[PDB]
Amino acid sequence: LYSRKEGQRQENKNKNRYKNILPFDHTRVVLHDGDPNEPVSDYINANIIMPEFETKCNNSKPKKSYIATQGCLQNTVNDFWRMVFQENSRVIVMTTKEVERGKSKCVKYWPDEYALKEYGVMRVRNVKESAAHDYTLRELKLSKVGQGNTERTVWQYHFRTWPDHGVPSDPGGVLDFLEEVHHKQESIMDAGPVVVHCSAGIGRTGTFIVIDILIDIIREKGVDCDIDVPKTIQMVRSQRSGMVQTEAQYRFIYMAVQHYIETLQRR
């Protein structure tokens, strides 16, 4: 029995970018510490994605997990930073421009270059922006206003060259990007889930997360390991509905997996 009841509540209606794209109750990110003046303060349109494989062992838990979320709305920016803080996330993957084809996809939820901004009780300083070819890396410092020993670096990997229609015609850029994200995440002791967002939090987000999951398997278990793309996609869809939206996205996943395997072989 699945449900999306919290997302459907009237107190949360302005917190969803699309009225019928909602988080499953059983995997939604529940925000425990917010503004007691808000009718509901525990809601964000976001789900934890935990890779689940029939052959997982008895530990806590998968090596990497993700938060799949929508692009911020002006009124959910403070919620977004509460989520990042609460979950101890240290890496954010933004897969859209702020505006594409004249349409806002995500509000700018981070400060201007070298600026600092307060978002509710959260304080963020933009320390540095480094532009690579397909992406910009922003080094952010996140802390809870008033509290000592809460500051932590959050690395925002902003992929900027996804085409306005369709998907990249070659997956090399996305794979190089994910390799950097992978190494940053492992460089930070006990970092929380990697936050990944697009606009609705399902199409591009699902494409990036499913590739990262498959690549993580191949990076570890080798070129000859068993890969089942449809089963991995269904596994992720059990945790957030609609992950991977189009035929081009679905095929892009296959192309990326094949490309990654090819890269390793050439070494």
Curated annotation (Swiss-Prot):
<comment type="function">
    <text>Acts downstream of various receptor and cytoplasmic protein tyrosine kinases to participate in the signal transduction from the cell surface to the nucleus. Positively regulates MAPK signal transduction pathway. Dephosphorylates GAB1, ARHGAP35 and EGFR. Dephosphorylates ROCK2 at 'Tyr-722' resulting in stimulation of its RhoA binding activity. Dephosphorylates CDC73. Dephosphorylates SOX9 on tyrosine residues, leading to inactivate SOX9 and promote ossification. Dephosphorylates tyrosine-phosphorylated NEDD9/CAS-L.</text>
</comment>
<feature type="binding site">
    <location>
        <position position="164"/>
    </location>
    <ligand>
        <name>substrate</name>
    </ligand>
</feature>
<feature type="binding site">
    <location>
        <position position="245"/>
    </location>
    <ligand>
        <name>substrate</name>
    </ligand>
</feature>
<feature type="active site" description="Phosphocysteine intermediate">
    <location>
        <position position="198"/>
    </location>
</feature>
<feature type="domain" description="Tyrosine-protein phosphatase">
    <location>
        <begin position="1"/>
        <end position="256"/>
    </location>
</feature>
<protein>
    <recommendedName>
        <fullName>Tyrosine-protein phosphatase non-receptor type 11</fullName>
    </recommendedName>
</protein>
<comment type="subunit">
    <text>Interacts with phosphorylated LIME1 and BCAR3. Interacts with SHB and INPP5D/SHIP1. Interacts with MILR1 (tyrosine-phosphorylated). Interacts with FLT1 (tyrosine-phosphorylated), FLT3 (tyrosine-phosphorylated), FLT4 (tyrosine-phosphorylated), KIT and GRB2. Interacts with PDGFRA (tyrosine phosphorylated). Interacts (via SH2 domain) with TEK/TIE2 (tyrosine phosphorylated). Interacts with PTPNS1 and CD84. Interacts with phosphorylated SIT1 and MPZL1. Interacts with FCRL4, FCRL6 and ANKHD1. Interacts with KIR2DL1; the interaction is enhanced by ARRB2. Interacts with GAB2.</text>
</comment>
<comment type="similarity">
    <text>Belongs to the protein-tyrosine phosphatase family. Non-receptor class 2 subfamily.</text>
</comment>
<feature type="binding site">
    <location>
        <begin position="198"/>
        <end position="204"/>
    </location>
    <ligand>
        <name>substrate</name>
    </ligand>
</feature>
